[PDB]
Structure formats: C-alpha cells, structure tokens
Design an enzyme around this catalytic site. Sequence first.
Site, PDB file in Angstrom:
ATOM      1  N   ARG A 109     -16.732 -16.041 -11.781  1.00 55.89           N
ATOM      2  CA  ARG A 109     -17.588 -14.903 -11.433  1.00 55.89           C
ATOM      3  C   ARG A 109     -17.255 -14.258 -10.082  1.00 55.89           C
ATOM      4  O   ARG A 109     -17.993 -13.405  -9.583  1.00 55.89           O
ATOM      5  CB  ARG A 109     -19.066 -15.310 -11.460  1.00 55.89           C
ATOM      6  N   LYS A 130     -11.035  -1.315  -5.984  1.00 53.91           N
ATOM      7  CA  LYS A 130     -10.680  -1.119  -7.390  1.00 53.91           C
ATOM      8  C   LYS A 130      -9.602  -2.111  -7.803  1.00 53.91           C
ATOM      9  O   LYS A 130      -8.539  -2.176  -7.196  1.00 53.91           O
ATOM     10  CB  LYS A 130     -10.183   0.306  -7.649  1.00 53.91           C
ATOM     11  N   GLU A 172       0.918   9.278  -2.095  1.00 53.46           N
ATOM     12  CA  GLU A 172      -0.448   8.903  -1.718  1.00 53.46           C
ATOM     13  C   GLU A 172      -0.714   9.157  -0.238  1.00 53.46           C
ATOM     14  O   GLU A 172      -1.833   9.524   0.155  1.00 53.46           O
ATOM     15  CB  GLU A 172      -0.695   7.428  -2.042  1.00 53.46           C
ATOM     16  N   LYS A 215      -9.129   7.421   3.510  1.00 53.22           N
ATOM     17  CA  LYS A 215      -9.755   6.780   2.364  1.00 53.22           C
ATOM     18  C   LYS A 215     -10.907   5.862   2.755  1.00 53.22           C
ATOM     19  O   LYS A 215     -11.889   5.755   2.027  1.00 53.22           O
ATOM     20  CB  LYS A 215      -8.722   5.982   1.567  1.00 53.22           C
ATOM     21  N   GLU A 225     -17.248   5.605  -6.875  1.00 54.69           N
ATOM     22  CA  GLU A 225     -16.803   6.860  -7.458  1.00 54.69           C
ATOM     23  C   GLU A 225     -17.915   7.651  -8.119  1.00 54.69           C
ATOM     24  O   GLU A 225     -17.736   8.205  -9.205  1.00 54.69           O
ATOM     25  CB  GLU A 225     -15.687   6.620  -8.475  1.00 54.69           C
ATOM     26  N   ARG A 229     -15.753   9.964  -3.800  1.00 53.62           N
ATOM     27  CA  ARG A 229     -14.581   9.131  -4.026  1.00 53.62           C
ATOM     28  C   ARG A 229     -13.746   9.708  -5.156  1.00 53.62           C
ATOM     29  O   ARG A 229     -12.603   9.306  -5.368  1.00 53.62           O
ATOM     30  CB  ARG A 229     -14.942   7.678  -4.334  1.00 53.62           C
ATOM     31  N   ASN A 233      -8.914  11.230  -6.597  1.00 52.70           N
ATOM     32  CA  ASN A 233      -8.164  11.423  -7.837  1.00 52.70           C
ATOM     33  C   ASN A 233      -7.418  12.749  -7.850  1.00 52.70           C
ATOM     34  O   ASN A 233      -7.040  13.250  -8.910  1.00 52.70           O
ATOM     35  CB  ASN A 233      -9.102  11.347  -9.045  1.00 52.70           C
ATOM     36  N   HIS A 236      -4.310  13.250 -10.104  1.00 57.59           N
ATOM     37  CA  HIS A 236      -4.125  12.090 -10.976  1.00 57.59           C
ATOM     38  C   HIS A 236      -4.462  12.428 -12.426  1.00 57.59           C
ATOM     39  O   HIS A 236      -4.063  11.724 -13.356  1.00 57.59           O
ATOM     40  CB  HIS A 236      -4.972  10.913 -10.485  1.00 57.59           C
ATOM     41  N   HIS A 240      -1.601  10.849 -14.111  1.00 55.99           N
ATOM     42  CA  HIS A 240      -1.784   9.681 -14.977  1.00 55.99           C
ATOM     43  C   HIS A 240      -1.188   9.871 -16.366  1.00 55.99           C
ATOM     44  O   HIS A 240      -0.700   8.916 -16.987  1.00 55.99           O
ATOM     45  CB  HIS A 240      -3.273   9.333 -15.084  1.00 55.99           C
ATOM     46  N   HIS A 250       4.469   5.898 -10.245  1.00 59.17           N
ATOM     47  CA  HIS A 250       3.116   6.387 -10.039  1.00 59.17           C
ATOM     48  C   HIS A 250       3.092   7.576  -9.078  1.00 59.17           C
ATOM     49  O   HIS A 250       2.578   8.638  -9.408  1.00 59.17           O
ATOM     50  CB  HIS A 250       2.262   5.251  -9.485  1.00 59.17           C
TER      51      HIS A 250
HETATM   52  N1  LIG Z   1      -7.424   2.009  -5.903  1.00 58.15           N
HETATM   53  C1  LIG Z   1      -6.480   1.273  -6.549  1.00 58.15           C
HETATM   54  O1  LIG Z   1      -6.684   0.092  -6.849  1.00 58.15           O
HETATM   55  C2  LIG Z   1      -5.114   1.948  -6.913  1.00 58.15           C
HETATM   56  C3  LIG Z   1      -4.837   3.200  -6.236  1.00 58.15           C
HETATM   57  C4  LIG Z   1      -3.452   3.570  -6.300  1.00 58.15           C
HETATM   58  C5  LIG Z   1      -2.514   3.082  -7.189  1.00 58.15           C
HETATM   59  N2  LIG Z   1      -2.936   1.919  -7.947  1.00 58.15           N
HETATM   60  C6  LIG Z   1      -2.111   1.144  -8.900  1.00 58.15           C
HETATM   61  O2  LIG Z   1      -1.029   0.605  -8.066  1.00 58.15           O
HETATM   62  C7  LIG Z   1       0.223   0.590  -8.818  1.00 58.15           C
HETATM   63  C8  LIG Z   1       1.276   1.429  -8.072  1.00 58.15           C
HETATM   64  O3  LIG Z   1       1.567   0.865  -6.799  1.00 58.15           O
HETATM   65  P1  LIG Z   1       2.978   0.155  -6.482  1.00 58.15           P
HETATM   66  O4  LIG Z   1       4.050   1.194  -6.351  1.00 58.15           O
HETATM   67  O5  LIG Z   1       2.902  -0.599  -5.245  1.00 58.15           O
HETATM   68  O6  LIG Z   1       3.306  -0.818  -7.714  1.00 58.15           O
HETATM   69  P2  LIG Z   1       4.267  -2.053  -7.954  1.00 58.15           P
HETATM   70  O7  LIG Z   1       3.516  -3.301  -7.773  1.00 58.15           O
HETATM   71  O8  LIG Z   1       4.807  -1.989  -9.334  1.00 58.15           O
HETATM   72  O9  LIG Z   1       5.463  -1.978  -6.862  1.00 58.15           O
HETATM   73  C9  LIG Z   1       6.594  -1.079  -7.136  1.00 58.15           C
HETATM   74  C10 LIG Z   1       7.845  -1.926  -7.162  1.00 58.15           C
HETATM   75  O10 LIG Z   1       8.183  -2.427  -5.856  1.00 58.15           O
HETATM   76  C11 LIG Z   1       8.526  -3.847  -5.897  1.00 58.15           C
HETATM   77  N3  LIG Z   1       8.220  -4.216  -4.504  1.00 58.15           N
HETATM   78  C12 LIG Z   1       6.964  -4.579  -4.029  1.00 58.15           C
HETATM   79  N4  LIG Z   1       7.000  -4.755  -2.716  1.00 58.15           N
HETATM   80  C13 LIG Z   1       8.322  -4.558  -2.339  1.00 58.15           C
HETATM   81  C14 LIG Z   1       8.984  -4.624  -1.077  1.00 58.15           C
HETATM   82  N5  LIG Z   1       8.384  -4.826   0.094  1.00 58.15           N
HETATM   83  N6  LIG Z   1      10.373  -4.458  -1.085  1.00 58.15           N
HETATM   84  C15 LIG Z   1      10.991  -4.120  -2.264  1.00 58.15           C
HETATM   85  N7  LIG Z   1      10.470  -3.982  -3.485  1.00 58.15           N
HETATM   86  C16 LIG Z   1       9.084  -4.246  -3.438  1.00 58.15           C
HETATM   87  C17 LIG Z   1       7.736  -4.378  -7.039  1.00 58.15           C
HETATM   88  O11 LIG Z   1       8.274  -5.574  -7.593  1.00 58.15           O
HETATM   89  C18 LIG Z   1       7.818  -3.194  -8.027  1.00 58.15           C
HETATM   90  O12 LIG Z   1       9.006  -3.346  -8.850  1.00 58.15           O
HETATM   91  C19 LIG Z   1      -0.111   1.132 -10.219  1.00 58.15           C
HETATM   92  O13 LIG Z   1      -0.207   0.021 -11.097  1.00 58.15           O
HETATM   93  C20 LIG Z   1      -1.415   1.913 -10.012  1.00 58.15           C
HETATM   94  O14 LIG Z   1      -2.213   2.039 -11.213  1.00 58.15           O
HETATM   95  C21 LIG Z   1      -4.218   1.383  -7.824  1.00 58.15           C
HETATM   96 ZN   LIG Z   2      -3.156   6.693  -6.906  1.00 56.64          ZN
END
Ligand SMILES: NC(=O)c1ccc[n+]([C@@H]2O[C@H](COP(=O)([O-])OP(=O)(O)OC[C@H]3O[C@@H](n4cnc5c(N)ncnc54)[C@H](O)[C@@H]3O)[C@@H](O)[C@H]2O)c1
Ligand SMILES: [Zn+2]
Length: 323
Positions: A109, A130, A172, A215, A225, A229, A233, A236, A240, A250
């Site tokens: 939980r 999130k 972002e 943020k 949201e 908040r 988006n 997005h 998305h 992304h």
């Molecule tokens: N509010 C939230 O929770 C929120 C907001 C924004 C985006 N997101 C989510 O976050 C994700 C996108 O973020 P992301 O780009 O970090 O994703 P990711 O985890 O897939 O990282 C991108 C790539 O970088 C690699 N990587 C990670 N750290 C590294 C480093 N220091 N050096 C080299 N390679 C590295 C990973 O293995 C991956 O292949 C999506 O799944 C999206 O839906 C969530």
């Molecule tokens: Zn985002």
Amino acid sequence: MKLQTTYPSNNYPIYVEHGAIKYIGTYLNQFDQSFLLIDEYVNQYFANKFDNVHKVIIPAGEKTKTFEQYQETLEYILSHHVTRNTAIIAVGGGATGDFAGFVAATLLRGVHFIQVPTTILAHDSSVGGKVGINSKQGKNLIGAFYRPTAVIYDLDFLKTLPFKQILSGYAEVYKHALLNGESATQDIEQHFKDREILQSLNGMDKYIAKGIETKLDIVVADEKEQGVRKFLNLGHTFGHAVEYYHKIPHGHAVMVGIIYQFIVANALFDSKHDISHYIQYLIQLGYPLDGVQMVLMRQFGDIVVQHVDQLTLQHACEQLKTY
Ligand SMILES: NC(=O)c1ccc[n+]([C@@H]2O[C@H](COP(=O)([O-])OP(=O)(O)OC[C@H]3O[C@@H](n4cnc5c(N)ncnc54)[C@H](O)[C@@H]3O)[C@@H](O)[C@H]2O)c1
Ligand SMILES: [Zn+2]
C-alpha cells in the site's frame, strides 16, 4: 541547490547538483531494506557508482513500463519478506522512475521512495508524484500520485547522454520556459541557440533548475491535475499521439506537439505565432524533422485549456505538414 515542496504536510527535498548521489546514503540508513531498481543500460553506465540493499535490474526505458513487468518486480521484491519501512530507490530516467514509483506506491500500500533521476527529461518526471505504467490501450493509462521521500538529482549523470536524449530532454526544459513566460523563453532561446551549444550542456544546470522551480509551483499549487497542473500538458495532446505511432523520443514528440499547439492557437484566437520562428529553432537545435481537450498558449502568460474540433485539428495538421 536544494529545492523543497511546500504542501500543508508530507513535503520532499529536491537535491539538484553535480554529485548529489552522495545524499542517497544519508537516507539508506533509516530503511530496513532498500531496493535499487536500476535501468538495464543505466546499470552498464554506472554500476560502479553504486557498488539490506538489493539491485533490481529492469528493462531499458519504456520496455519496463508494462503491466507484466509490474507483477514480476512486485512479486520478486515481495519474496524478500519486506516491510512497510522498505525503500524503492529509482536509478534511471523517467521510465524507470514511473515504474519503480508505481511499485513503491502499491507495495504494501506504499513504501518509501527515493528518486534518482539520470536524464535531463527526468528533471520534470521525478517531480510531482505522477508514477505508473502503460496499458495495451495507451500511454501511462495506469498509475498513481505518490510523493517520493526525496528527489536526488546528480547532474554528473547527464554527461553520458547521447544527443538523442539531450534533444528529448530539452523539450521539457523548453516547455517549462514557455510556461514560465516570454522573457524566460527568449532567454533560453538565445543561450541554447544551436546544436553545438545544446550538445555541450553548458548552462543546462541553471535552466534545469529553473525548470524544476516552474513545475514545483504548479504541482504544489495543483497536485492532482484539477486546475493549473494541466498547463504542464502543453504540446502533449498531439505529442503523446505522434509518439505512439512513430515511436520517436518523448521530447521529440512534445516539440512537434508544441509546434502543433501554436498552429491551433492561431486558428482559434489568431495569436500571430511565428510558426516559421519555432520551426527554425528546432532546426538549429538539431531536431530530426521527419471536442478534444488541449493546453493552448493564446499568448505568453495566457495559457488556456479547451476543446478543439477535428476540422481545426485537421487544418492544424495540414499547416504542419507544410514544413
Ligand atoms: N510527471 C511524470 O511522471 C512524467 C513527465 C514527463 C515524462 N514522463 C515519462 O518519462 C519517460 C521519458 O523520460 P526519459 O527520456 O528519461 O525515459 P527513459 O527512461 O527511457 O530514458 C531514455 C534513455 O536513456 C537511457 N539513460 C538513462 N539515463 C542515462 C544516462 N545518464 N546516460 C545515458 N543513457 C541514459 C535509458 O536507458 C533510456 O534508453 C516516458 O516514459 C514518459 O511517459 C513522465
Ligand atoms: Zn512530458
């Protein structure tokens, strides 16, 4: 720099600095066990920076955000006869943070949760609570809101990011600047004016921190949201989608959605957005260029959320294909 949430209670610190990885130990002590959930690739890169605490290697990027991987990790962890005083430390990008975060949110939980973001785009994802996974239907369709115990952002992790991830994360940083205002947008546009400067990450620290503060205002203001908040988006709606069909990064998709967004605002409110200006900025940064709700910027400082008909989106997409 240490930032901190200001909710009426249950707030968390946000350590943003080169070498913040140290602060993880200071916590680890007050936990029975600690599960270091780290990205497959990320583990290759920093397995040494980390070597009661167990490392759980999960899939790379979005590959782990499945309902299946959700059951396996919970089960695997549960087998270790854990307690409610267990922490889930998320080492990796946004994808691992969301997944690990959903494990931490639902395990018994809700157990303790430490965010250890390693990407630029994670300046956004590690903040706000999130967490979640994807569903065969679409993106982050299953999840929860869950505050980490702390966010430990070490900027040295960024040194190993391919340009592809730099570009993706920048979207972002740039969205927050856009939401932060015209003065912050022209400020960041002038600094990160080309691929070379961006790829060097020079001064990304300041902009990343600025991004987190932006943020941090919105999410402390509207955590669930239910109001402002939703401005986060920005771009997005169309982003998305584009992402789920062309499977581009992304951030790459957000940029395309941020352009799209500007085109839509021009149709409705006739904002007089120099679309040609934004397009050229993406080109200079090195971005590969190859009633539905929606966060629209009518003007810097006048962000709105409203429906849009297919005809307007149909015309907005026509215009975009021009470029
Ligand atoms: N509010 C939230 O929770 C929120 C907001 C924004 C985006 N997101 C989510 O976050 C994700 C996108 O973020 P992301 O780009 O970090 O994703 P990711 O985890 O897939 O990282 C991108 C790539 O970088 C690699 N990587 C990670 N750290 C590294 C480093 N220091 N050096 C080299 N390679 C590295 C990973 O293995 C991956 O292949 C999506 O799944 C999206 O839906 C969530
Ligand atoms: Zn985002």
